[PDB]
Amino acid sequence: TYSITLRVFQRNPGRGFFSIVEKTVFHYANGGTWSEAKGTHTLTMGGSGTSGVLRFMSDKGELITVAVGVHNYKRWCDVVTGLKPEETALVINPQYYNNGPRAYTREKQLAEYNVTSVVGTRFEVKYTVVEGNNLEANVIFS
Amino acid sequence: TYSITLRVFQRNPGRGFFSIVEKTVFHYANGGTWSEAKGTHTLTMGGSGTSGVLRFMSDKGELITVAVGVHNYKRWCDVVTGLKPEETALVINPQYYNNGPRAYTREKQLAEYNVTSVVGTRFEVKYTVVEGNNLEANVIFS
Amino acid sequence: TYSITLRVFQRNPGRGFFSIVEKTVFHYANGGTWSEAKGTHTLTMGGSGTSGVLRFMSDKGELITVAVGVHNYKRWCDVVTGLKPEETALVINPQYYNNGPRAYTREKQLAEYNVTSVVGTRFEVKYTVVEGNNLEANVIFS
Amino acid sequence: TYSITLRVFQRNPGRGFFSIVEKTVFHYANGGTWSEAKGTHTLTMGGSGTSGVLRFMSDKGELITVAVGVHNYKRWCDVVTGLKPEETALVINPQYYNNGPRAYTREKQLAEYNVTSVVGTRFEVKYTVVEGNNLEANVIFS
Ligand SMILES: CC(=O)N[C@@H]1[C@@H](O)[C@@H](O)[C@@H](CO)O[C@@H]1O
Ligand SMILES: CC(=O)N[C@@H]1[C@@H](O)[C@@H](O)[C@@H](CO)O[C@@H]1O
Ligand SMILES: CC(=O)N[C@@H]1[C@@H](O)[C@@H](O)[C@@H](CO)O[C@@H]1O
Ligand SMILES: CC(=O)N[C@@H]1[C@@H](O)[C@@H](O)[C@@H](CO)O[C@@H]1O
Ligand SMILES: CC(=O)N[C@@H]1[C@@H](O)[C@H](O)[C@@H](CO)O[C@@H]1O
Ligand SMILES: CC(=O)N[C@@H]1[C@@H](O)[C@H](O)[C@@H](CO)O[C@@H]1O
Ligand SMILES: CC(=O)N[C@@H]1[C@@H](O)[C@H](O)[C@@H](CO)O[C@@H]1O
Ligand SMILES: CC(=O)N[C@@H]1[C@@H](O)[C@H](O)[C@@H](CO)O[C@@H]1O
């Protein structure tokens, strides 16, 4: 099994406050499950080769997704911003597979990624434990 | 908009205790979002014609999904039991659409549904507010 | 240290639906902390001789407290029903100590307790692991 | 009635990550209740003259309390850091009343407060809606 445990940091009240509105798990590698403990979020997966997505909405209406997973035994991540209401995590998660338009990002096996949305919100995913089967990352909104 | 607010009742400790492991929203009708308040769960959707799925796992390992949505201005529900780890909510939710194998169940526009899993767990979804745009249902595990 | 992990089973929609409105920890035995994981609640305490209280409110306005702790190396529990709004958990938890009016109930060291309230709600606390330092109980509203 | 709604912003992973371990409500003004919605925390109180406390613990072991309430129709707040395990919120909340050692801080009726702890964690409470019965504040750990 692989697990990825996420801690969500929110830095700047001027951007609003984000909460989870959707959590998906892709079906490869015997799937997996999201759980919550002590304010953190863990994605537990049946092996290497799958992922999950958290979609967040701010109290100012902004929609963004955070994807994390393991590809060929190495962690990966992505953040997609500027989403329309119909672009749910259910739409987004599969786009990393089956030659979809986000596969290239999974293939990078990134330990960190940064993006600013068009409306000016900074997002970062930074793995703090980057190797092995019990991975850890901070997700930072600013 | 349509909303469906769910209250989860668990009746029988002998079946174990269930918690949410995934929440999806289908992309029709401008999508929608899950939220939590006072121990309840609300799916807020952009109009009639979409749905969302909660997947639950018990502390005894059982996996089941609960689907709720609105089809042609009437509520619907379903429960799928006996799921394998790879049959995530991300797999299940789309199966109600595009002539998928669960579409017939959405088309029934049920205000209640009952099923017992092969391992003996009873599940019921029962709408308590069955008309209008602010729907309410109890989800009962036993 | 001692821990008590609680699973809350709400059986009967006719009583309405309860959510937590307060959680206290008494200061003996070097105190302790409440945490949440996978829909459960754990009180971790620094030794034998302290306790914590969860207060619940139903969406029909009913207020009740559940107390759990360890007294002379044995678990105890209590449920107080029919509470007024001014009777917060902060009021109730100390009443088990300093020769307060609920001390006798702590002293019973009960592994199960059943009480039905003035509005008809049935409450049960039943420990499923009743000995040792890693205690487990079901809290059932019916 | 008065309500205070809190949004918790954790800015700095270097301080570790905090989660709630206790929530108390003082018994004046007919008491009150904590609730959670969309990742936020609301204390609802029966009138002016009471308060509640959230205690937080970081995954590095740090214990701190945030107190919020209404005194003579004006909001107040306080943050206490460097707490010992025996100094539970149940100990701290009453210290603002009955001529206790923190009463002066309540009496200040602060709309903002900044304190940095012995281990270097910066805390700020800042009310964003500072008048009326529907109060709002950001709680920032940095
Ligand atoms: C071992 C491993 O991670 N295998 C994965 C496989 O499961 C699938 O995700 C594929 C997608 O292009 O990428 C890899 O081959
Ligand atoms: C108005 C309405 O609910 N329309 C829906 C549409 O959105 C889609 O879900 C379709 C699937 O067969 O079922 C209906 O036509
Ligand atoms: C060892 C042990 O549990 N000691 C406790 C002590 O901590 C205190 O709670 C007292 C209350 O009357 O009951 C016992 O003596
Ligand atoms: C109206 C009002 O806020 N009254 C309060 C009262 O309830 C109590 O908290 C007291 C503490 O010294 O401070 C004020 O007098
Ligand atoms: C502005 C923005 O959010 N762009 C995203 C980018 O972050 C992401 O890596 C890519 C692949 O999923 O899709 C979009 O280009
Ligand atoms: C035993 C079991 O869970 N059967 C489910 C049924 O409940 C559901 O309505 C149907 C359509 O989704 O799929 C399966 O037949
Ligand atoms: C009806 C009711 O809630 N009675 C409670 C009882 O359960 C509790 O054990 C006792 C001591 O705390 O106080 C009250 O008698
Ligand atoms: C370093 C620290 O946490 N000091 C606190 C201060 O913040 C608080 O206002 C006061 C009254 O409660 O108690 C302590 O002096």
> Ligand 2: which residues within 6 Å by Cβ?
B 28-29, 48-49, 71-72, 97
Put simply, the answer to whether B24 touches A94 (Cβ < 8 Å) is no
* Residue whose CB lies within 8 A of the most ligand 2 atoms, among B71, B95, B102, B133, for a mutation test: B71
The neighbouring-strand residues paired with A65 are: A55, A80
For B1-142, CATH number? Answer: 2.60.270.20
Kindly give the pairing relationship between strand B51-58 and strand B112-116: unpaired
Distance C14 CA to ligand 5 centre (A): 48
Closest CA to B8 of B78, B56, B47: B56
Resolution (A): 1.3
φ and ψ at residue D110, rounded to 5 degrees: -75, 140
- Find the ligand nearest to A2 CA: 1
Q: Which DSSP state fits A48?
A: S
Element (H or E) spanning D90, and its range? helix D89-92
Put simply, the answer to whether C21 touches D35 (Cβ < 8 Å) is yes
- CA torsion sign for A10, A15, A16, A20 is negative
Distances (CA, A) of C89 to A60, C93, D64: 35, 6, 20
Q: Counting beta carbons within 10 angstroms of the beta carbon of residue C36, is it exposed (0 to 12), middle (13 to 18) or buried (19 or more)? A: middle
Put simply, the answer to whether D35 touches C19 (Cβ < 8 Å) is yes
Are the beta carbons of C107 and C69 closer than 8 angstroms? no
- Residue D84 distance to chain B (closest CA, Å): 31
* CA C55/CA C110 separation, integer angstroms: 19
* CA D47/CA D49 separation, integer angstroms: 6
Interface test with D, best of C27, C35, C62, C65 (most D CBs within 10 A): C27
Q: Which DSSP state fits A59?
A: T
Put simply, the answer to whether B38 touches D36 (Cβ < 8 Å) is yes
The neighbouring-strand residues paired with C64 are: C56
- What tokens were used for C108? 């019973």
The residue to which tokens 């088309």 are assigned: B107
- For residue C51, give the amino acid letter: S
* CA D108/CA D11 separation, integer angstroms: 27
Are the beta carbons of C53 and C96 closer than 8 angstroms? no
The neighbouring-strand residues paired with A64 are: A56
Say how many residues make up chain C.
142
- What tokens were used for C75? 């678990």
* CA D77/CA C79 separation, integer angstroms: 32
Q: Which residues of D touch B (CB under 8 A)?
A: 35-38
> Ligand 6: which residues within 6 Å by Cβ?
B 78-82, 102, 105, 115
φ and ψ at residue B86, rounded to 5 degrees: -80, -10
Residue nearest to atom 5 of ligand 3 (CA): C49
Say how many residues make up chain B.
142
- What tokens were used for A87? 């672009």
- CA torsion sign for D101, D102, D106, D107 is positive
Three-state DSSP at D87 gives coil
Residues with Cβ within 8 Å of B39's Cβ and at least 6 positions away in sequence, in order, are B7, C17, C18, C19, C20
Residues with Cβ within 8 Å of B45's Cβ and at least 6 positions away in sequence, in order, are B1, B2, B3, B4, B25, B29, B30, B31, B32, B51, B52, B69, B70
- For residue A129, give the amino acid letter: V
The neighbouring-strand residues paired with B18 are: B58
> Ligand 5: which residues within 6 Å by Cβ?
A 78-82, 102, 105, 115
Distance C95 CA to ligand 4 centre (A): 24
* CA B71/CA B83 separation, integer angstroms: 25
- Residue A72 distance to chain D (closest CA, Å): 28
Distance D57 CA to ligand 2 centre (A): 48
Are the beta carbons of B64 and B80 closer than 8 angstroms? yes
Q: Which residues of C touch A (CB under 8 A)?
A: 35-38
Are the beta carbons of A1 and A46 closer than 8 angstroms? yes
Element (H or E) spanning D92, and its range? helix D89-92
Three-state DSSP at A113 gives strand
* CA A5/CA C87 separation, integer angstroms: 39
Ramachandran class of D14: left when φ > 0, alpha when ψ lies in -120 to 50, beta otherwise: alpha
* CA D108/CA D102 separation, integer angstroms: 11
Say how many residues make up chain D.
142
Residue nearest to atom 6 of ligand 6 (CA): B80
> Ligand 7: which residues within 6 Å by Cβ?
C 78-82, 102, 105, 115, 117
- What tokens were used for C109? 């060291």
- Find the ligand nearest to D93 CA: 8
- What tokens were used for A79? 């953040």
Distance B88 CA to ligand 5 centre (A): 25
- Residue A35 distance to chain C (closest CA, Å): 6
* CA A109/CA A124 separation, integer angstroms: 15
The neighbouring-strand residues paired with D27 are: none
Are the beta carbons of D54 and D43 closer than 8 angstroms? no
* CA D68/CA D20 separation, integer angstroms: 15
Instruction: Annotate chain B with DSSP letters as a single string.
Output: -EEEEEEEEE--GGG--EEEEEEEE-SGGG-EEEEEETTEEEEEESSSS-EEEEEEEETT--EEEEEEEEETTEEEEEEE-S--TT--HHHHGGGGSTT-TTHHHHHT--SEEEEE-TTS-EEEEEEEE-SSSEEEEEEEE-
Put simply, the answer to whether C20 touches B12 (Cβ < 8 Å) is no
Q: Counting beta carbons within 10 angstroms of the beta carbon of residue D119, is it exposed (0 to 12), middle (13 to 18) or buried (19 or more)? A: middle
Residue nearest to atom 5 of ligand 8 (CA): D80
* CA D125/CA D65 separation, integer angstroms: 11
Instruction: Report the residue of chain D nearest B34, measured CA to CA.
Output: D38
Closest CA to C66 of C8, C108, C133, C142: C8
Chains with 3 or more CB pairs closer than 8 angstroms to C? A, B, D
Are the beta carbons of B39 and B78 closer than 8 angstroms? no
Are the beta carbons of D52 and D44 closer than 8 angstroms? no
Closest CA to C13 of B111, B11, B9: B9
3-state SS, one letter per residue, for chain C: CEEEEEEEEECCHHHCCEEEEEEEECCCCCCEEEEEECCEEEEEECCCCCEEEEEEEECCCCEEEEEEEEECCEEEEEEECCCCCCCCHHHHHHHHCCCCCCHHHHHCCCCEEEEECCCCCEEEEEEEECCCCEEEEEEEEC
Residues with Cβ within 8 Å of D75's Cβ and at least 6 positions away in sequence, in order, are D4, D68, D69, D109, D110, D111, D127, D130, D135, D137
Which residues in chain C are contacts of A37 at CB distance < 8 A?
A: 35-38
Are the beta carbons of B78 and B55 closer than 8 angstroms? no
Are the beta carbons of B57 and A33 closer than 8 angstroms? yes
Residue nearest to atom 7 of ligand 1 (CA): A49
Q: Counting beta carbons within 10 angstroms of the beta carbon of residue A29, is it exposed (0 to 12), middle (13 to 18) or buried (19 or more)? A: buried
Exposure string for B10-48, b = 16+ CB within 10 A, e = fewer: bbeeebbbbbbbbbbbbbbbebbbbbbebbbbbbbbbeb
Kindly give the pairing relationship between strand B32-37 and strand B18-25: unpaired
The neighbouring-strand residues paired with A114 are: A124
Interface test with D, best of A6, A8, A9, A138 (most D CBs within 10 A): A9
The neighbouring-strand residues paired with A115 are: A123
Are the beta carbons of D89 and C93 closer than 8 angstroms? no
Q: Counting beta carbons within 10 angstroms of the beta carbon of residue D53, is it exposed (0 to 12), middle (13 to 18) or buried (19 or more)? A: buried
